[PDB]
Amino acid sequence: ADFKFEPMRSLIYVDCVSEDYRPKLQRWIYKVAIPDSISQFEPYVTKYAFYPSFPIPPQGDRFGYARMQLTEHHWLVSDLDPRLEIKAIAETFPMDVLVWQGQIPEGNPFIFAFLPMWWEKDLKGKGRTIEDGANYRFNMTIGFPEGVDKAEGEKWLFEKVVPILQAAPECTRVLASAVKKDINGCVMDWVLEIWFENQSGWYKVMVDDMKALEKPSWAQQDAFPFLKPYHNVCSAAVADYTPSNNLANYRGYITMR
Amino acid sequence: ADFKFEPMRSLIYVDCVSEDYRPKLQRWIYKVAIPDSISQFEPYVTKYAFYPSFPIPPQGDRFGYARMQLTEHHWLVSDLDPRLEIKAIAETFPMDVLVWQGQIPAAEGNPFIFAFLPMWWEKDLKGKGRTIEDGANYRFNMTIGFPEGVDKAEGEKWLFEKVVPILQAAPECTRVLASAVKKDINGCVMDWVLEIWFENQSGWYKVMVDDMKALEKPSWAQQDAFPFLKPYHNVCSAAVADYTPSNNLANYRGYITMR
Amino acid sequence: ADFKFEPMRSLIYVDCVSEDYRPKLQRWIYKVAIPDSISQFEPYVTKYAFYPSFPIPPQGDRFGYARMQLTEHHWLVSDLDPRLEIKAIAETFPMDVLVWQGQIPAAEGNPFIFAFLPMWWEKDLKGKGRTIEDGANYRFNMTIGFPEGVDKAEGEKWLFEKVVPILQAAPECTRVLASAVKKDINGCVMDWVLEIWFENQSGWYKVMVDDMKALEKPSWAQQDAFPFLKPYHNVCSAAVADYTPSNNLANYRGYITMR
Amino acid sequence: ADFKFEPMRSLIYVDCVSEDYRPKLQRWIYKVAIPDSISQFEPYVTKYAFYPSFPIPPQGDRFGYARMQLTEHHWLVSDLDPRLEIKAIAETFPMDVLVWQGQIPAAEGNPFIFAFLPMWWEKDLKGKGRTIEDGANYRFNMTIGFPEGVDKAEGEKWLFEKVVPILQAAPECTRVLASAVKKDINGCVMDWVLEIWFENQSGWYKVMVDDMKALEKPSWAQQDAFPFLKPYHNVCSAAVADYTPSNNLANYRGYITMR
Amino acid sequence: ADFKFEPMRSLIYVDCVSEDYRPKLQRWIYKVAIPDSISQFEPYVTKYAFYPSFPIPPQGDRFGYARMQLTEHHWLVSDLDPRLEIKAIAETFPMDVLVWQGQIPAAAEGNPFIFAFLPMWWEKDLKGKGRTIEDGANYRFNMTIGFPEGVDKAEGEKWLFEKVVPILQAAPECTRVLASAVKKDINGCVMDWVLEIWFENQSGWYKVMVDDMKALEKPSWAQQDAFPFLKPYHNVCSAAVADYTPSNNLANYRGYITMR
Amino acid sequence: ADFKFEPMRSLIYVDCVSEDYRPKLQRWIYKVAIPDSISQFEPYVTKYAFYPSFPIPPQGDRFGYARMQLTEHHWLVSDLDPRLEIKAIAETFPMDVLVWQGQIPAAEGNPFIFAFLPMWWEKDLKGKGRTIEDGANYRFNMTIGFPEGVDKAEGEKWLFEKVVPILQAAPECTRVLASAVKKDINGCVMDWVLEIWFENQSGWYKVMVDDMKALEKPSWAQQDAFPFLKPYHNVCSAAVADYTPSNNLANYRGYITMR
Numbered sequence A: 001a002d003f004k005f006e007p008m009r010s011l012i013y014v015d016c017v018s019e020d021y022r023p024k025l026q027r028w029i030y031k032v033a034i035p036d037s038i039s040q041f042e043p044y045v046t047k048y049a050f051y052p053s054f055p056i057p058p059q060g061d062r063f064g065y066a067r068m069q070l071t072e073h074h075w076l077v078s079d080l081d082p083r084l085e086i087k088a089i090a091e092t093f094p095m096d097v098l099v100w101q102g103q104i105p106e107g108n109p110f111i112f113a114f115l116p117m118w119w120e121k122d123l124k125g126k127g128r129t130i131e132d133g134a135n136y137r138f139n140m141t142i143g144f145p146e147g148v149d150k151a152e153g154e155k156w157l158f159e160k161v162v163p164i165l166q167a168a169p170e171c172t173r174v175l176a177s178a179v180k181k182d183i184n185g186c187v188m189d190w191v192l193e194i195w196f197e198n199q200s201g202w203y204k205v206m207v208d209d210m211k212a213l214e215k216p217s218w219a220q221q222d223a224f225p226f227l228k229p230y231h232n233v234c235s236a237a238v239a240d241y242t243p244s245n246n247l248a249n250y251r252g253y254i255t256m257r
Numbered sequence B, C, D, F: 001a002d003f004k005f006e007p008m009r010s011l012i013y014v015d016c017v018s019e020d021y022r023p024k025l026q027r028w029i030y031k032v033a034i035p036d037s038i039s040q041f042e043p044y045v046t047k048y049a050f051y052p053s054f055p056i057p058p059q060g061d062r063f064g065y066a067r068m069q070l071t072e073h074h075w076l077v078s079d080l081d082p083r084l085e086i087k088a089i090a091e092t093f094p095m096d097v098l099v100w101q102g103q104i105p106a107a108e109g110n111p112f113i114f115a116f117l118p119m120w121w122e123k124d125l126k127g128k129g130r131t132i133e134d135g136a137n138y139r140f141n142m143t144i145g146f147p148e149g150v151d152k153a154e155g156e157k158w159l160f161e162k163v164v165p166i167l168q169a170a171p172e173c174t175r176v177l178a179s180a181v182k183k184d185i186n187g188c189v190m191d192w193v194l195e196i197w198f199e200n201q202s203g204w205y206k207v208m209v210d211d212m213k214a215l216e217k218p219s220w221a222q223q224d225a226f227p228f229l230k231p232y233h234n235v236c237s238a239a240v241a242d243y244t245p246s247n248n249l250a251n252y253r254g255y256i257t258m259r
Numbered sequence E: 001a002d003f004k005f006e007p008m009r010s011l012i013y014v015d016c017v018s019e020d021y022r023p024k025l026q027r028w029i030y031k032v033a034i035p036d037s038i039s040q041f042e043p044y045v046t047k048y049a050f051y052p053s054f055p056i057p058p059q060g061d062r063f064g065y066a067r068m069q070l071t072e073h074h075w076l077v078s079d080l081d082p083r084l085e086i087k088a089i090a091e092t093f094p095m096d097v098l099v100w101q102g103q104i105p106a107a108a109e110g111n112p113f114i115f116a117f118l119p120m121w122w123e124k125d126l127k128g129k130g131r132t133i134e135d136g137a138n139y140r141f142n143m144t145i146g147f148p149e150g151v152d153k154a155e156g157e158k159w160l161f162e163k164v165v166p167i168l169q170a171a172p173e174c175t176r177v178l179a180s181a182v183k184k185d186i187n188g189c190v191m192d193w194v195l196e197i198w199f200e201n202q203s204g205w206y207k208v209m210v211d212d213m214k215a216l217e218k219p220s221w222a223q224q225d226a227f228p229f230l231k232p233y234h235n236v237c238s239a240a241v242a243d244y245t246p247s248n249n250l251a252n253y254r255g256y257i258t259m260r
């Protein structure tokens, strides 16, 4: 019988591999994914929201930049509990959505990271408010390649990478949670959000300041983040606010006139 | 102090024993029951909804057919925890509502069936993977409880080995789902809840009446024909649509009157 | 350029000619008709709502009883202005909906009754000052149009001098209201819309069937008994509650499916 | 047929003549007045809202200070068109509400002040261009009507030549706005509505009491001090905030009770 | 990892120490506090609401009467779990709000911030069980108390329930009495009890909470001469509120829309 | 007194001249513009919405492509009526917003294009009857105004006799719609607004760039290629989806920040 109280925040990195797919993928998301979703999890999800990603910045491709959105659920129970596999009504989820997102064409894994509802580490910019200004919120998840010691990767991240973020005045905030791997075997290890004022601030720090970094022995590309795009790193730059707070705001797929 | 996280889906089988009562019972439900309810459980119920039952089909009376609605709560805690008996404001619940629902007559009355379930169906026995796009569903929700002194394991075995296969054989039946009732919560006499989908009333009839004549009449039967259980006492049911506009936590804006 | 301020209340009498059609027609209405509709007229309709009809009462068939609902719009402009025919996105309206409503068979076929009215009742002939606290109302909404070649003044005189007094005499009848149909808008064949309240179905029957036998059968009668008009062609009706949860502009949150 | 497009903003000055009445009057307003109201005018009112008045300031009694709220409707048509008198469902409006508001006593009562205005202020006499970021406003809304047999032109001249300049001189006063009352609608005795903003109650006092002592007492004065008009009869007022949570068409979700 | 399921009802006693502050404090609450709040706790709070207090009644000052509102959260987890201190976006909460509420003087002794955690359901129902909304409009006097330092808690409880409550039960003017014990283990709130005591109106409140209560033995630990015998705003806070608020913030809020 | 019933649809072409400005401009729009706006026009605007533009396509710069959104109001009265200039609270509109949108540099600046239209399209030139089920639309909304000293009738003739036929010839173009700009309202320099649908960006390109090379370059042309008009000055545009979540009158619940 018993079901564990397991409050978590999920993030899904929704890419769009081509502008010709955008109308169709966007349609599916807003016309189909929302109602199918709420139909299933309304009673045990407290917040379902989409954060459309800003235009892909220069060299964003190398950070597995999700060109469509982030998809953010707040769960009261583990959606991977086997008993939750049973649904009266099932979702409409065509093959085509996976083509559009880039799961299918070599093809890219579906990154679904589970987190505790609150950030575990606050490494810069504590006490910042909304009045302090509009944030270019760079959300990035990473997973160290196979056969790399996790403790060693953690040590690299926090002792080599983060200090560069702390040094940069262009970087207003740094936050990190460790991925709940015990839930869905997500290959990612960390999720970070790193705020800037704008795209140029992002570039200056995440490209130029980061050239200073020693290229690690396990690197899957020459430059930071040294991890395989869309496979061992995904990301998105998003705004402080979304109008797509789906549990509160959705009123059907109303069409423009 | 401690309060156990106990996520459940409740169903109440709301009958209406006479069309002359319908205006008044419907009024109570939508004008009074909703605000009184939300006033009490808003902080620990995630979804409160009413699914109006379709017109009672031929021989529906024999399945304890609730002629008004199903009432569906999603709980985060056991509403039968004794500490939850204390309410600043109490509900308005007249005698008359029980007359209307058939709990009391003008000449024997009917129990109030309030079944607690896990939020997710336990058994998916037909039609897995069906979506809303596959078409409009005549959703026959039926709960049953085996008569007193009938072994539960034996009743389970009957249900799943004799009854369900007839549903599986029938092309008219698009879906079959079952959960075992949480009896430990409120001593509900029912044992199972099933939802059995059809295309329409005729599909329902063809299977639940005609195909079911084939069944061996069990020794404990309380009526001659399937479901072999006493209407409204050991079986209640309702046929409902996929969608309700009465999703009360989101949708309610007061008892606004027609012009 | 100029667009006339034309505040009106529309009523559409939505029938359902068979229970096997109900799931599918209900689906279309709530899953498709609503969003397609709001997509088009949100900026110039102040209220869009559906009032599900109560179960068809005995002999309701003879009053063109809409077995599904009433569909009620409040317009700021004439939807029949020719310039309003152009829509970026058009509605999905299958042939099948007309089968289900009885506009076509799959056994003669019934017109689509869409009556335009002023937003306020023109005549208040009984029960003025009645409030919601006075009790739950069985609201019988009925529209009528006199057969071809019948003088309109003469029909009016019949209605108000012969019919209405029987309603006024009956204590079972709590309210009587009437507006004259705007015929100048969409050529609707109906002439009047009335709402006649009772306590319940039996009150309705006692008055609209039994008390009405007393009436002189007029020379133009299209059937033996009141209302003396051809069902679904020259009379449509529905009995509805004071309240609907389907106040679509405020309440709709998508076609969310039961679990 | 034709109904004139008449966009207006109404204000009703809702007093509460005793603290012992506040619970009951407040209940009526929020439990009964809202749903009865929306039930009637939803299709032709674009905004219905209540602005609770701040605590009555010193000597506010002399300005006909409404100790409960302002009631603010935005109309698309004249509610005083005679055809709008007919309502299917009528409102619940007990005698007691009039006692509570002070229309009737337990020993002379007070008129019901219902002022119709154009939706936009006619005169902007101070503080043009002020935004919400400029700070929180103590908004003193005051309506006045000159006693019987006082020339209106002469009263206007007094107001704009003697009164207004004192407001303009006072740095404590951040804003001055005025519309002339639509008298042609409901024969409201009032002539002007003004809103006069301060930072706080003391600012209000300093200007509307102390600075105003400077004023010549006019020959028609109905009291010794400004505003020289009979409280609640020829002057009503209220001090309100920039924001109300009671924007009733958008926000109302029923009379949900505290736990 | 694990986070405990801890369903609770919080109450915050929001005072306003001067009418000249009311516009500004009210603005902050409705323009800023709400969105900043929902931005943080939307996923684990089921109900966030404000109950504006009725006008301070005669001698209400002596009961630590919050002249602005009550602030009522329903939590699914302990907001005082240390891991909940981390927020992406932090709240805007100026010094000035503390001046307005009376936590600080503007340039000199202030008043503590009373934030009481409770179980979601009342623990004791001591009068008026079964009363409905149809029974009439309620003057709901919510009052929290905490016994002075070095007063035995069991002894204070015994005083409250054996001396005070019977006066409430005797008074026909008092329609309801409810009490929960404060969860002290959560945030070290100095208060011990929260009670709600209903009347018909302000005069009913006065007749009972002032006049009937004169009958009471003045305890040895008393911090003022008259009931409630506790230091205003420090060891007792209160508010009289209506059955209904329009500020049910999770459901109702549509932005800080300004009057025209 | 009188206020004319003037139902209209406005469009504002909101550009964003640099990605470094997007966070800040987007913030202003969603945090400030919305509440300031609703605070002013809630009672006489039936729909306020934002349609975020898709990524600027190849050579979109030449069509005055608004890189932020379209801003769409539905008015019941002319916002340019002089009496509507008076507002109690005024809007917060920094210099910086004009920098971000490109009205000013920190080169050469760009006019603020605010086009008023009838609520319904005047000309339906292709794809009549198309529904939402027919598929997802790349909706290219484009407004144009003919250079100074060009006869308007002659420009109209060019548009409908030369340009539109190319759209009609292209199977890649699923829809063509046009309204004439109400110039009598706000002296907007634009003359027409068109919406031209494709399947996707490539369809847009193939037709609006490649097929359009076929066109005779007119004598008044302000650039070599179609649309032959000065970007952002005599032509603005945006490609948008069928649906926006930013339907501000229904959906806005404050500036809630991500966690």
Ligand SMILES: O=C1c2c(O)cc(O)cc2O[C@H](c2ccc(O)c(O)c2)[C@H]1O
Pocket: A032, A033, A034, A036, A037, A040, A091, A092, A093, A110, A112
């Ligand atoms: O319930 C689910 C769901 C849904 O209800 C609606 C919807 O529109 C998409 C969905 O997608 C979820 C999903 C599918 C495949 C995966 O590989 C995965 O990780 C998650 C699925 O579980």
Ligand SMILES: O=C1c2c(O)cc(O)cc2O[C@H](c2ccc(O)c(O)c2)[C@H]1O
Pocket: A012, A014, A029, A033, A034, A037, A040, A041, A071, A079, A097, A101
């Ligand atoms: O919006 C969502 C979403 C999406 O936008 C894109 C995508 O590719 C998959 C998705 O799937 C999400 C989901 C739904 C139900 C579940 O039970 C679940 O685990 C995940 C869904 O809500």
Ligand SMILES: O=C1c2c(O)cc(O)cc2O[C@H](c2ccc(O)c(O)c2)[C@H]1O
Pocket: B032, B033, B034, B036, B037, B040, B090, B091, B092, B093, B112, B114
């Ligand atoms: O909270 C409750 C409640 C309520 O608040 C409002 C309302 O309108 C009806 C209600 O009915 C519930 C109930 C009553 C009698 C029973 O015999 C039973 O099992 C359940 C009760 O629990």
Ligand SMILES: O=C1c2c(O)cc(O)cc2O[C@H](c2ccc(O)c(O)c2)[C@H]1O
Pocket: B012, B014, B029, B033, B034, B037, B040, B041, B071, B079, B097, B101
């Ligand atoms: O709609 C409801 C309902 C109803 O429609 C019919 C009926 O006969 C009883 C009911 O009672 C339900 C209820 C309310 C509060 C509770 O705490 C509870 O356990 C049950 C109520 O919500």
Ligand SMILES: O=C1c2c(O)cc(O)cc2O[C@H](c2ccc(O)c(O)c2)[C@H]1O
Pocket: C032, C033, C034, C036, C037, C040, C091, C092, C093, C112, C114
């Ligand atoms: O706007 C319209 C419309 C719509 O927007 C949505 C929808 O779901 C059905 C609709 O149907 C309307 C209609 C009126 C009269 C008829 O005789 C008929 O076939 C159809 C149509 O005009």
Ligand SMILES: O=C1c2c(O)cc(O)cc2O[C@H](c2ccc(O)c(O)c2)[C@H]1O
Pocket: C012, C014, C029, C033, C034, C037, C040, C041, C071, C079, C097, C101
């Ligand atoms: O619900 C509705 C409805 C319906 O339920 C049944 C039906 O058979 C036709 C309908 O059509 C209505 C309609 C839509 C658009 C219009 O422009 C119009 O005048 C009427 C629609 O709103």
Ligand SMILES: O=C1c2c(O)cc(O)cc2O[C@H](c2ccc(O)c(O)c2)[C@H]1O
Pocket: D032, D033, D034, D036, D037, D040, D090, D091, D092, D093, D112, D114
């Ligand atoms: O319909 C109305 C109405 C209503 O629907 C609801 C309500 O709660 C109060 C109301 O009161 C209005 C009114 C009554 C008496 C007057 O003397 C007056 O000037 C106005 C009336 O118009």
Ligand SMILES: O=C1c2c(O)cc(O)cc2O[C@H](c2ccc(O)c(O)c2)[C@H]1O
Pocket: D012, D014, D029, D033, D034, D037, D040, D041, D071, D079, D097, D101
């Ligand atoms: O809030 C309202 C209100 C009120 O709060 C107090 C009061 O004493 C009268 C009132 O009457 C208002 C009203 C309703 C309908 C009308 O047609 C009308 O003209 C006025 C009502 O809505």
Ligand SMILES: O=C1c2c(O)cc(O)cc2O[C@H](c2ccc(O)c(O)c2)[C@H]1O
Pocket: D134, D135, D136, D137, D138, D174, D198, D199, E024
């Ligand atoms: O002392 C004050 C003050 C100040 O010292 C400096 C300054 O730049 C602006 C100010 O303006 C404040 C204010 C004025 C009018 C209001 O209506 C309001 O809410 C606030 C006031 O507090």
Ligand SMILES: O=C1c2c(O)cc(O)cc2O[C@H](c2ccc(O)c(O)c2)[C@H]1O
Pocket: D171, D172, D206
């Ligand atoms: O001494 C003064 C003064 C005064 O004598 C009386 C009075 O009633 C108000 C006053 O206020 C004046 C003032 C002007 C501008 C401000 O911004 C401000 O705070 C105050 C100031 O000149």
Ligand SMILES: O=C1c2c(O)cc(O)cc2O[C@H](c2ccc(O)c(O)c2)[C@H]1O
Pocket: D171, D172, D173, D199, D200, D202, D203, D206
């Ligand atoms: O008496 C007053 C006064 C004064 O006499 C002298 C002085 O030097 C300043 C003053 O300033 C006060 C004031 C000004 C503007 C406000 O906006 C406000 O609330 C208060 C005013 O009342």
Ligand SMILES: O=C1c2c(O)cc(O)cc2O[C@H](c2ccc(O)c(O)c2)[C@H]1O
Pocket: A131, E024, E027, E028, E032, E092, E094, E095, E096
């Ligand atoms: O800049 C700000 C500020 C500041 O710099 C210093 C300081 O001591 C207080 C402050 O407080 C401002 C504020 C006042 C009242 C409110 O109601 C509000 O939301 C914010 C804030 O903006």
Ligand SMILES: O=C1c2c(O)cc(O)cc2O[C@H](c2ccc(O)c(O)c2)[C@H]1O
Pocket: E032, E033, E034, E036, E037, E040, E090, E091, E092, E093, E113, E115
């Ligand atoms: O998160 C919090 C918060 C917030 O987000 C928004 C807001 O407008 C007020 C707030 O106030 C809370 C608080 C303040 C002072 C205290 O002394 C205290 O105990 C708690 C704080 O925790």
Ligand SMILES: O=C1c2c(O)cc(O)cc2O[C@H](c2ccc(O)c(O)c2)[C@H]1O
Pocket: E012, E014, E029, E033, E034, E036, E037, E040, E041, E071, E079, E097, E101
């Ligand atoms: O309304 C609220 C509020 C208030 O009105 C006044 C005040 O002085 C403090 C407040 O603080 C509340 C709060 C408490 C705990 C939190 O963890 C939080 O985020 C916010 C906030 O919700």
Ligand SMILES: O=C1c2c(O)cc(O)cc2O[C@H](c2ccc(O)c(O)c2)[C@H]1O
Pocket: F032, F033, F034, F036, F037, F040, F090, F091, F092, F093, F112, F114
């Ligand atoms: O009311 C208005 C308004 C507003 O309320 C809020 C807001 O955030 C921006 C605004 O801008 C509008 C506007 C700006 C520039 C123009 O050139 C023009 O014609 C109109 C203005 O009218």
Ligand SMILES: O=C1c2c(O)cc(O)cc2O[C@H](c2ccc(O)c(O)c2)[C@H]1O
Pocket: F012, F014, F029, F033, F034, F037, F040, F041, F071, F079, F097, F101
């Ligand atoms: O969103 C809007 C908007 C905008 O988004 C961007 C922009 O650059 C100007 C704007 O101005 C619009 C406006 C407001 C009030 C009015 O009276 C009016 O005519 C226009 C506003 O609503």
